[PDB]
Amino acid sequence: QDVVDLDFFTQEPLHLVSPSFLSVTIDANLATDPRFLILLGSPKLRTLARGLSPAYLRFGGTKTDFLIFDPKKE
Amino acid sequence: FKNSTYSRSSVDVLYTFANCSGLDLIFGLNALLRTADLQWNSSNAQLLLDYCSSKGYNISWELGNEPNSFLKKADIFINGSQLGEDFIQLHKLLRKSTFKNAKLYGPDVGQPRRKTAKMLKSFLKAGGEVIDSVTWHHYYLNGRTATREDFLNPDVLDIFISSVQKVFQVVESTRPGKKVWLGETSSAYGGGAPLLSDTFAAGFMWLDKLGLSARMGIEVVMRQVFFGAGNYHLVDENFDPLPDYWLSLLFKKLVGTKVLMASVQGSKRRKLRVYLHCTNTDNPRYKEGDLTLYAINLHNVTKYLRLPYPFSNKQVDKYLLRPLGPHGLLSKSVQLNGLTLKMVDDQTLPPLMEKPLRPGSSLGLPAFSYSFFVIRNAKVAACI
Ligand SMILES: *[C@@H]1[C@H](O)[C@@H](O)[C@H](OCCNC(=O)C(F)(F)F)[C@@H](C(=O)O)[C@H]1O
Ligand SMILES: *[C@@H]1O[C@H](CO)[C@@H](O)[C@H](O)[C@H]1NC(C)=O
Ligand SMILES: *[C@@H]1O[C@H](CO)[C@@H](O)[C@H](O)[C@H]1NC(C)=O
Numbered sequence: 097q098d099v100v101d102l103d104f105f106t107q108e109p110l111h112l113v114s115p116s117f118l119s120v121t122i123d124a125n126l127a128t129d130p131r132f133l134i135l136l137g138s139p140k141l142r143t144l145a146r147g148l149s150p151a152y153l154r155f156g157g158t159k160t161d162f163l164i165f166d167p168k169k170e
Numbered sequence: 171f172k173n174s175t176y177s178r179s180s181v182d183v184l185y186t187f188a189n190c191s192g193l194d195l196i197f198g199l200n201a202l203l204r205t206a207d208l209q210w211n212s213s214n215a216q217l218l219l220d221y222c223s224s225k226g227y228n229i230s231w232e233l234g235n236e237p238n239s240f241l242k243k244a245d246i247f248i249n250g251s252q253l254g255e256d257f258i259q260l261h262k263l264l265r266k267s268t269f270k271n272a273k274l275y276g277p278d279v280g281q282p283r284r285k286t287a288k289m290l291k292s293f294l295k296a297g298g299e300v301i302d303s304v305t306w307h308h309y310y311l312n313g314r315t316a317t318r319e320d321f322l323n324p325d326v327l328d329i330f331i332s333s334v335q336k337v338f339q340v341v342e343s344t345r346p347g348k349k350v351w352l353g354e355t356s357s358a359y360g361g362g363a364p365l366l367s368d369t370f371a372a373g374f375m376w377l378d379k380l381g382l383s384a385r386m387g388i389e390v391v392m393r394q395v396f397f398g399a400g401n402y403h404l405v406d407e408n409f410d411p412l413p414d415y416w417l418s419l420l421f422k423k424l425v426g427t428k429v430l431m432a433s434v435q436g437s438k439r440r441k442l443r444v445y446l447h448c449t450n451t452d453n454p455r456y457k458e459g460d461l462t463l464y465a466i467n468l469h470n471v472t473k474y475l476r477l478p479y480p481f482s483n484k485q486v487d488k489y490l491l492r493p494l495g496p497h498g499l500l501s502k503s504v505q506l507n508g509l510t511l512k513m514v515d516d517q518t519l520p521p522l523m524e525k526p527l528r529p530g531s532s533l534g535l536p537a538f539s540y541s542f543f544v545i546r547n548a549k550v551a552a553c554i
């Protein structure tokens with residue numbers, strides 16, 4: 097047969113995760129996309145992002161260590 | 171990999187995306203800007219810090235990504251001790267800034283193989299005191315070689331346990347009690363596995379990763395990526411959500427922060443995988459004391475799960491995910507309790523509708539599927 101019995105432990109929490117436990121990245125490489133501004137502007141994408149709130153958003157990647165901040169550049 | 175500059179404009183786009191989406195931005199600083207004697211040259215970062223504080227930007231920080239492969243990536247070797255020192259320098263600059271309580275996370279090392287274990291242990295001896303969380307990265311497979319069989323293999327899922335135990339071994343021996351985060355995690359590195367990382371098949375690894383992360387004491391999991399060129403994106407090129415977006419939204423609405431335990435009676439306990447948390451109380455439909463069970467069936471037949479005393483006759487809502495055909499586990503579309511999940515419009519996520527089960531009935535979970543079950547009126551004190 098394919099009946100399976102579960103055992104549950106419920107006396108106390110074994111751990112507490114962050115409300116932000118399920119969080120997301122944007123790869124640092126996406127700041128080298130010409131269309132970067134259009135992409136994060138997207139109303140549609142904002143809707144999807146808001147659905148995962150609360151979350152950390154990590155801006156990071158391989159390219160993290162090849163990105164230089166230019167106070168001048170437009 | 172060549173250098174590239176980015177503008178205040180980019181910092182502004184990123185920050186308003188995060189801000190307007192209700193997400194907490196973490197920004198990784200270039201750690202390969204060095205001085206003559208391979209110390210971290212911090213003047214560029216000092217600029218970005220200034221600009222950000224001027225604009226009123228509430229931001230958390232990282233320094234470097236996968237320092238363990240800087241030699242391969244840039245023919246520079248930095249050891250853990252130096253990197254720890256580099257992190258103390260950054261902490262200083264943050265303390266002397268306008269958000270002096272800004273969080274610092276690191277060191278975003280790859281999975282704990284001997285060289286990486288050594289790097290992380292020496293990083294934490296030296297810089298451990300100034301980080302608010304230890305970040306490390308995990309991937310199950312190489313995106314170039316991964317197969318559909320690998321995505322369905324419980325021997326592949328199980329490897330993650332060992333990785334987690336190795337990280338906790340380094341941390342307990344250098345900084346007992348420090349929070350441990352997955353800072354970048356996915357099915358497969360190299361941008362994901364074409365026709366696999368973006369499909370319903372990807373959900374076995376993702377839901378299992380979440381279940382085991384919670385159970386084993388990981389406080390935060392960061393999914394490579396929300397959006398991007400990578401096959402492992404939650405959202406595709408046309409800003410349409412893939413099956414992992416929906417899995418993620420379901421998890422987010424149903425699963426609480428209080429982690430419990432579930433297990434199967436028997437010696438085969440590899441293909442049927444079970445996780446138990448307190449129900450997310452912010453879920454308007456549920457009340458204090460309710461349980462969320464979630465379960466992965468990698469058997470090739472339906473299994474029928476029986477709740478133990480005193481939960482055997484409780485009202486249960488099922489949230490079963492199943493691919494929309496014709497492409498089976500390789501589908502990019504998913505159904506919740508037989509209803510296809512689609513945005514209502516660009517502004518509107520649909521409802522996520524329960525299927526109340528007959529009280530006392532066993533929990534049917536079809537072959538190659540995953541489901542949530544909410545045990546209504548469980549009255550578990552540890553949850554209340
Ligand atoms: C971790 C590393 O930090 C990532 O930069 C790297 O992602 C490679 C390219 N990814 C993309 O551009 C994206 F977002 F997918 F569109 C991953 C990886 O290997 O996948 C990892 O090493
Ligand atoms: C750090 O870099 C900046 C310019 O890139 C320079 O002003 C400073 O003197 C550098 N320090 C070094 C290379 O030790
Ligand atoms: C690590 O690197 C630093 C900076 O390059 C160097 O001075 C030192 O000898 C190394 N430390 C250890 C413990 O090997």
Ligand SMILES: *[C@@H]1O[C@H](CO)[C@@H](O)[C@H](O)[C@H]1NC(C)=O
Nearest residue numbers: 438441468469470471472537
């Ligand atoms: C199903 O899985 C069994 C293991 O329980 C396996 O040996 C068998 O060949 C597979 N296929 C079907 C449809 O039974």
